[PDB]
């Protein structure tokens, strides 16, 4: 039913909105009531790229497992919460975990989520943009809650994989 | 010197002379292949049948009513028995039987069923006969046809489940093969105008089966329990859950019946060593019995990776001791939820319905 299938993975501190980013992209739903991710969770969606039908297979998460999680992944969304500076400091660690287990050729996108929380902002866009440029990461600010840029995020990262 | 007849326009009744009742049943029930109604509205046979019943009621022929219904019911049963493997036919007749029952309620004359009728529909109600008891019979028959439907469907899926849910690695039958089959089921039930509430409950039932069969298989196989199969398993379930959303069946309750199998898939992935890991498992696995949780842990086989200790398993058994879990290890894969058949009055009007020529009922006279 599709022509290419791309494994794409979600990573970042708990509570930054990976699961809602997944549920907003794949089924256009969002919950204020945080439901725990347990083990690895999945969701897919067929997206159009060129004249090609790509099945975005998005992985989500709460040691051997850690390698099965990154192995094969051709894309990743590295997510933090623009309202919680700690989740952004941790991005360096998640970057190291990624580069240890994934293919060098993986396309990586830094994602500052919860951009609707403008009045609570803890991580200025410019700093995060700089960090991404420095480490060769694509960058974007999303809100799973009001949906701003969620479509563009996955669309963008899937388009850079080809 | 002769009782003449009053002239009037078609009133939506069908008349046959008592001699042709056998033929009616043959051309309208026994020999009626579903595909012969390719391009008409659904459940035409139901409507036709009620038009014949109206006319029996109109002429106060209480013998012709009893004979017509009794002969139809026996006809349907005879068809469903000869075609006890045929999912199309079973679904066809479950649809017509229900719609017939809908017509007997909507046009019963009892105010309670007629709150949604148009002025022109209220005209077409039964005048003389209260057929409550025949409705009760038709209602029973529909339970039976429903049960034959689930049988046929489960009978087709059962051999596919284990290979499709566990064995095949996507991240002999593949999960796609199960989806193509359920698609076909959904498409038959739709094209034949089976009540959506019934389509829902049918898929709720099929999914409870997939749950029970897969989980039982996990609980009897040591080789197949590991985190890797937990992952494939979870992905496969999430693929089934997305199928449901795609056909608008996500409110059937199907998802909820898979909760045990989902928790078994999560259990397979969870850490299982520290006191912390044991508190989590008991918090999570609310839909698995103590024995089942314990069973999956004893069967847990790693791929660099350790096995589940005896002290760990005894630590779990102690926490779950407070709750009284069932003595049966396995789920009843053949458990059957009792179905609720709704009442769904239509807006079709008896006087606008005409039999297509392909049905061979020229001997029916439009009154
Ligand atoms: N305000 C706001 N809250 C969000 C957004 N995305 C997720 N959340 C909230 O953050 C909490 C954790 O979300 P979740 O997706 O479960 O985080 P995860 O652990 O990374 O998957 C939940 O209460 C959500 O309501 C967003 O864009 N804006
Ligand atoms: Mg989550």
From Swiss-Prot, chain A:
Q: What cofactor does this one take? A: Mg(2+)
Q: Give compartment(s).
A: Cell membrane; Endosome membrane; Recycling endosome membrane; Cleavage furrow
EC class: hydrolase
User: Among the entry's GO cellular component annotations, what is one?
Assistant: cytoplasmic vesicle membrane
Q: Which UniProt keywords apply?
A: Acetylation, Cell cycle, Cell membrane, Cytoplasmic vesicle, Endosome, Glycoprotein, Golgi apparatus, GTP-binding, Hydrolase, Lipoprotein, Membrane, Methylation, Nucleotide-binding, Prenylation, Protein transport, Transport
Residues annotated as binding GTP are 14-20, 31-32, 34, 36-37, 113-114, 116, 144-145
User: How the protein is affected by changing residue 34 to F?
Assistant: Nearly abolishes SH3BP5-mediated guanine nucleotide exchange
Q: Where is this motif: Switch 1?
A: 30-41
Binding of Mg(2+): at which residues? 19, 37, 60
Q: What family is this protein classified in?
A: Belongs to the small GTPase superfamily. Rab family.
Q: What protein am I looking at?
A: Ras-related protein Rab-11A
Q: What is the lineage of its organism?
A: Eukaryota, Metazoa, Chordata, Craniata, Vertebrata
| Entire-sequence positions represented here | 7 to 173 of 216
Swiss-Prot record, chain B:
Tell me the ranges covered by the Dilute domain, including all copies: 70-322
- What subcellular locations does the record give? Cytoplasm
Q: Which domain of life is it from?
A: Eukaryota
Signal peptide segment: none
| UniProt-reported outcome of changing residue 235 to E | Abolishes interaction with RAB11A; has no effect on RAB8A interaction
Q: How does it assemble?
A: Component of the CART complex, at least composed of ACTN4, HGS/HRS, MYO5B and TRIM3. Interacts with RAB11FIP2, RAB11A, and RAB8A. Found in a complex with CFTR and RAB11A. Interacts with NPC1L1;. Interacts with LIMA1.
The record's disease note says:
Diarrhea 2, with microvillus atrophy, with or without cholestasis: A disease characterized by onset of intractable life-threatening watery diarrhea during infancy. Two forms are recognized: early-onset microvillus inclusion disease with diarrhea beginning in the neonatal period, and late-onset, with first symptoms appearing after 3 or 4 months of life.
Q: Which family does it belong to?
A: Belongs to the TRAFAC class myosin-kinesin ATPase superfamily. Myosin family.
Q: What does this protein do?
A: May be involved in vesicular trafficking via its association with the CART complex. The CART complex is necessary for efficient transferrin receptor recycling but not for EGFR degradation. Required in a complex with RAB11A and RAB11FIP2 for the transport of NPC1L1 to the plasma membrane. Together with RAB11A participates in CFTR trafficking to the plasma membrane and TF (transferrin) recycling in nonpolarized cells. Together with RAB11A and RAB8A participates in epithelial cell polarization. Together with RAB25 regulates transcytosis.
Mind telling me what this protein is named? Unconventional myosin-Vb
Q: Which residues of the full protein are shown?
A: 1457 to 1848 of 1848
